[PDB]
Structure 1
């Protein structure tokens, strides 16, 4: 009746059919701090169904202080809302995982463990603490858990979706190869409007919007994000690259070679940090070393000495930067979507994707064997008016 399992017996990426009221259990349902209740949907990925008053101390309140923006301090405050959020997000990951491209993308993310580059001693491997959360256990104690990704509700401006992470005092973790745990502010309960001529009035599929955010996550997890000071007169190269298509092509090919070579070298610094490593604080040295051999697709010799293969680097680098794009998701989903990142949004809408009469894992809104199946009729905010309520612009 949500339709979380259209084929087979169980869900294929998300590990449980959770309800928000399920008892805390210390393993995959727990109280955590970065004191909130959270759900572990997969190895290395948690969902926290709460407005984000947490990650930024100048954003501990949902008060309006306003370009494209939308506020409502009441959103995501009841338990039924929280249960809907969590099943909505759950359903999206299963939608993303039903495609070849999304199975590739989500695997890369789970294997993308932030580098253990914490030590001040250049021969000791150590974790970085902002790449963990604290999980209250079955007895009542904490333990620190390493994770790659957190999906969390939006702060004051409900439609400011973004992917962010905590910084280091010396290191630039999103741009040195290392990586860092990524926080996605997102909601499945809202989407955006754009115009299209088959003038037509359509809404973006929220699977494609989550996928955009997850693509920024992969860049930042393998530490290969573009400096945000590189822009067009504003859109950064980092956005142009994530959208892909013809928009990406205006990053000149000589600039690309220069970017790729800079990061070949950073992956080279990482290989030799692994090699010049003698101790580990906090599993063996050689076991954690092999976690990172596996992440960065490193070669090992008879000495047990790691290096960067050039084919293997180009392969991973190309997958993360060129293949994993918004544009390519649109192709796999067979949905309607904006043709360039340069598009101005018009309206915001309230939606409910949880019931299978409203949205499915295979078709999104554009439900097969009905009138919704043709001409992107399900994303038409007049024909399928039932499924979209207008709120701003």
Structure 2
């Protein structure tokens, strides 16, 4: 049986109000599946996180629009089993296990109250969960995997903002929503080693596509995201960090080090908010004080802990910013991947990673004991054409 995903959810499965539920994104309800503590999956196209982006009608170099995708319960059960299977694959790694744990730990901070002495949740770091008796109760979560909006292949990580606070960047953190599909993959290129096998089309293992957005999710959960302002003469610092590898030192070790001490200080600001705290709204004040100490790897002192172990911050901060990277995950999955984010994808492939004969948790497309095992022939869209239907812009 499983390990990350508690049970095997079918979309047919009956609402129970706890892990199978109709919810409201903080509008009409959607069935949602709590695959793991703090992590839900919504197998719908995302019409909800954007008040403007409330449609799927076509209006970016590579794009793909189909208003009907993720419409049938047959699609939604598959979408769910895909994300599930992709969750298991990423968790099957020492890297993916550690990052999912940082993500489950990374509970968004209680910086909600105008009141300086008071801890309160921020409304947006919740969903409203309709309990079978036909009533709604707010539940905190860290992560939502949701299906895409109009552009099917527009994968991202977003979060409800604060009227004053930069939640993903002040250390607080915020509930994270990933528009993601295990139902599509993009083509990239590399001509192997056999010096040159011309211009072939390999497919991205969508476990990498998912890993990418989780690393963003982890960044934004620990409120250590880099301002999307910060770019390369034009590519996001946050993306270059997230991709990692040869790209990673395009970001100067100058801003690398100011970014680090800026977050150290926003951690200390957070450790003072707790100590100064004398009240709580809605769990125990101390229980909730100890979840954030667990989160920010806080210390011990009988007067009232307070201290940030600058040595322990360093190990968390780097784990999140410099080890949790797309490149490192590529070495673990042992797949053919982009050698840079500065790439672009060329083609869009319809895939089905659900049937174990198509894709596994341990090898993805590149199945053991087959031709797909050699030379990443699993990911090669010319050889494994039976697992990739090319589509256009």
What TM-score results when the alignment is normalised by the length of structure 2?
0.96
The secondary structure found in structure 1 opposite 2:250 is coil
The separation in 2 between residues aligned to 1:314 and 1:66, in whole angstroms, is 38
Which moved further from structure 2: 310-319 or 284-293?
Answer: 284-293
CA deviation map 1:166-207 (0-9, x unaligned): 00001110110000000000000000001221x322100000
CA deviation map 1:87-106 (0-9, x unaligned): 01100000011111000010
- What is the Cα deviation at residue 66 of structure 1? 4.2
Alpha carbons 2:171, 2:222 under 8 Å: kept: yes
Aligned structure 1 segments of 4 or more residues deviating by more than 6 angstroms: none
**Which residue of structure 2 aligns with residue 121 of structure 1?**
115
- What is the Cα deviation at residue 295 of structure 1? 0.3
The separation in 1 between residues aligned to 2:100 and 2:75, in whole angstroms, is 26
Which moved further from structure 2: 276-285 or 158-167?
Answer: 276-285
**Which residue of structure 1 aligns with residue 195 of structure 2?**
none
The separation in 1 between residues aligned to 2:74 and 2:385, in whole angstroms, is 24
The secondary structure found in structure 2 opposite 1:207 is helix
Which runs of no fewer than 5 residues in structure 1 stay unpaired? 1-9
- What is the Cα deviation at residue 245 of structure 1? 0.1
**Which residue of structure 2 aligns with residue 377 of structure 1?**
377
Alpha carbons 2:7, 2:35 under 8 Å: kept: yes
**Which residue of structure 1 aligns with residue 79 of structure 2?**
85
Alpha carbons 2:189, 2:202 under 8 Å: kept: yes
Which moved further from structure 2: 355-364 or 63-72?
Answer: 63-72
The separation in 2 between residues aligned to 1:66 and 1:275, in whole angstroms, is 48
The separation in 1 between residues aligned to 2:299 and 2:76, in whole angstroms, is 45
CA deviation map 1:91-138 (0-9, x unaligned): 000001111100001000000000000111100111100000011112
CA deviation map 1:195-221 (0-9, x unaligned): 221x32210000000000000000000
CA deviation map 1:41-61 (0-9, x unaligned): 000000000000001111111
CA deviation map 1:247-289 (0-9, x unaligned): 0112111211111011110001001111111111212211111
Which moved further from structure 2: 75-84 or 65-74?
Answer: 65-74
CA deviation map 1:213-252 (0-9, x unaligned): 0000000000000011111122110000000001011211
The separation in 2 between residues aligned to 1:355 and 1:193, in whole angstroms, is 21
Alpha carbons 2:155, 2:180 under 8 Å: kept: yes
**Which residue of structure 2 aligns with residue 59 of structure 1?**
53
Alpha carbons 2:91, 2:97 under 8 Å: kept: yes
Alpha carbons 2:298, 2:305 under 8 Å: kept: no
CA deviation map 1:27-72 (0-9, x unaligned): 1101111111111100000000000000111111101114221100
**Which residue of structure 2 aligns with residue 73 of structure 1?**
67
Which runs of no fewer than 5 residues in structure 2 stay unpaired? 192-198
The separation in 2 between residues aligned to 1:358 and 1:370, in whole angstroms, is 12
Which moved further from structure 2: 105-114 or 57-66?
Answer: 57-66
What TM-score results when the alignment is normalised by the length of structure 1?
0.96
**Which residue of structure 2 aligns with residue 6 of structure 1?**
none
Alpha carbons 2:129, 2:136 under 8 Å: kept: yes
The secondary structure found in structure 1 opposite 2:33 is strand
- What is the Cα deviation at residue 304 of structure 1? 2.4
The separation in 2 between residues aligned to 1:174 and 1:95, in whole angstroms, is 27
Alpha carbons 2:271, 2:308 under 8 Å: kept: yes
The separation in 1 between residues aligned to 2:145 and 2:188, in whole angstroms, is 25
Which moved further from structure 2: 67-76 or 43-52?
Answer: 67-76
